[PDB]
């Protein structure tokens, strides 16, 4: 018992959207789990400070945007920011 969370299912889904026909071993799932669990904090912690400096109290997108501009090196930043911008401005249009 004592349920645990994970990201397995979502990983598998995303996998199916690129090589729709390729399996994934067990451990190589646990890895890709831990990896997300890492990057998540490595961004959220940074954004926390970044807000705390200018003495705000809320976290919004804008900083997450900046915070990304700091960690991801170069072209990955160029892409990810476009991705975010897009995949939010849609959502706000249709709640």
């Amino acid at each position: 018992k004592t349920r645990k969370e994970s990201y397995a299912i979502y990983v598998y889904k995303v996998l199916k959207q690129v090589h729709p026909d390729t399996g994934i071993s067990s451990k190589a799932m646990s890895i890709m789990n831990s990896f997300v669990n890492d990057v998540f904090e490595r961004i959220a912690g940074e954004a926390s400070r970044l807000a705390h400096y200018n003495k705000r109290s809320t976290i919004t997108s804008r900083e997450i945007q900046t915070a990304v501009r700091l960690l991801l090196p170069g072209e990955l930043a160029k892409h990810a920011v476009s991705e975010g911008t897009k995949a939010v401005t849609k959502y706000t249009s249709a709640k």
């Binding site: 690129v18 072209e75 990955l76 892409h79």
Partner: protein, 35 residues
Amino acid sequence: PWSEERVVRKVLYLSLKEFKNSQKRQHAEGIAGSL
């Protein structure tokens, strides 16, 4: 004012193999968007 001759004498003396980058990974800049 450029010591090309001196650097070429250095090329003749040192004369050792050198290592550098090989491939162009522009695909990470490309298909990544289409991913």
